[PDB]
Design a protein around this nucleic acid. Structure first.
Lengths: 213, 213
DNA sequence: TTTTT
């Protein structure tokens, strides 16, 4: 079947900046190329069709071009509402196929996480379980490493990590890491540490707490 | 206005079949074809096919022929898609999307989508645990529930900024989710902070006030 | 068979 290729997979840009993303058709499709915008947690919206025709309501700062097998979508002076994902899709007969998408994120200055650690709740301890939680909030860039240490030894089992999508108010990312243990194993150790290593420092950020305290 | 109403999330066992609906209104149902697109969690878009309500004609993406069945009911302006022999690969959000003025035109109106989860895991209500420690961060741990989703709010919406609700993570057939909220330290605990958790699948609601350890 | 519906 016909295959579309989008580039780049991800791009960071500032509001007011001008960028261009591309899409390549494995076979000639003339100018029958559409672009869709999809906001985090929203349904896609049509932005362009016939490679250069803007759908109704789409601002003029959006500009598509190309024909044949190589296409580009240019966004002049990006606005807050422009960040999110972009998919190209040819509409030259069936089957329709989509590019893998370009995720366009906001660029901001580097920022260290605000780290908070929480011991298992007495409630949970009564059920036989013990989850230790660590929030690594509002940091940038998105890349970060978290490690759990119990009495000094790193614990790799039972760790659940989850990242939020970029905050639309301050362009940061947040992450939650939960170390889950059984209550009796939890009672066999005293020191629990959430350790984060981020670009913003050579010294990892550390939050700890002692069971007996 | 053009509206596409799709059926709610579905939980179905591997090997069974599922049928979802898309009720249209706002236009001449029979004047546009109805496409179906698949989107797996945090992944791209894949065209499944379309049906022409006017004549019940159907075009399928070859990968989906024999798998997906597109039907249509003119009297109720509703389009249906049935998927058989479900496997984990079928867990995803499915959208009905109204075609353009002509079938080969770019799709223009996307529905909200129907989330489908294929699993043999059983519906399990969540356990909700408090996360208590010039800002202070508090939290709520929503553990061991199935299937998605759960909704989490703070003080029934009165606390909205400073909130981070992390995407749930599956572990051994159960989901775990966390949510943090950051408030002025002076305000807590004199001003109460409560997380309100709802898990519609198990018809469960839980309110947990966060109190000082 | 390619867009002011």
């Amino acid at each position: 079947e016909l295959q579309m290729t989008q580039s780049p997979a991800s791009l960071s840009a500032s509001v007011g900046e001008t960028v261009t993303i591309t899409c390549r058709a494995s076979e000639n499709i003339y100018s029958y190329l559409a672009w869709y915008q999809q906001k985090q947690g929203k349904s896609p919206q049509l932005l362009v069709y016939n490679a250069k025709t803007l759908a109704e309501g789409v601002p003029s700062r959006f500009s598509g071009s190309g024909s044949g097998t190589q296409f580009s979508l240019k966004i002049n002076s990006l606005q807050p509402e422009d960040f999110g994902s972009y998919y190209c899709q040819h509409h030259y007969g069936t089957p329709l196929t989509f590019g893998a998408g370009t995720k366009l994120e906001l660029k901001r200055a580097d920022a260290a996480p605000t780290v908070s650690i929480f011991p298992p709740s007495s409630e949970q301890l009564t059920s036989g379980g013990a989850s230790v939680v660590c929030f690594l909030n509002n940091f940038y860039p998105k890349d970060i490493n978290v490690k759990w240490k119990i009495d000094g030894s790193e614990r790799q089992n039972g760790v659940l990590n989850s990242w939020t999508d970029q905050d639309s108010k301050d362009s940061t990312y947040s992450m939650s890491s939960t170390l889950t243990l059984t209550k009796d194993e939890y009672e066999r150790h005293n020191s629990y540490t959430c350790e984060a290593t981020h670009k913003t420092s050579t010294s990892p950020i550390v939050k700890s707490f002692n069971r007996n305290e | 206005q053009v509206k596409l109403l799709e059926s709610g999330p579905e939980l179905v066992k591997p090997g069974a079949s599922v049928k979802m609906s898309c009720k249209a209104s706002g236009y001449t149902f029979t004047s546009y074809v109805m496409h179906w697109v698949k989107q797996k969690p945090g992944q791209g878009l894949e065209w499944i096919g379309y049906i022409n309500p006017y004549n019940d004609g159907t075009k399928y993406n070859e990968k989906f022929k024999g798998k997906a069945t597109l039907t249509s009911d003119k009297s109720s302006s509703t389009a249906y898609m049935e998927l058989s022999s479900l496997t984990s690969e079928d867990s995803a959000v499915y959208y009905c999307v109204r075609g353009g003025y002509r079938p080969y035109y770019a799709m223009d109106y996307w529905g909200q989508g129907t989330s489908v989860t294929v699993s043999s895991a059983k519906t399990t209500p969540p356990s909700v645990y408090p996360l208590a420690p010039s800002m202070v961060t508090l939290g709520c741990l929503v553990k061991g529930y199935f299937p998605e989703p759960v909704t989490v709010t703070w003080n029934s919406g009165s606390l909205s900024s400073g909130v981070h609700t992390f995407p749930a993570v599956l572990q051994s057939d159960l989901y775990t989710l966390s949510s943090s909220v950051t408030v002025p330290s002076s305000t807590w605990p004199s001003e109460t902070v409560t997380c309100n958790v709802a898990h519609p699948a198990s018809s469960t609601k839980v309110d947990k006030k966060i109190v000082p350890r």
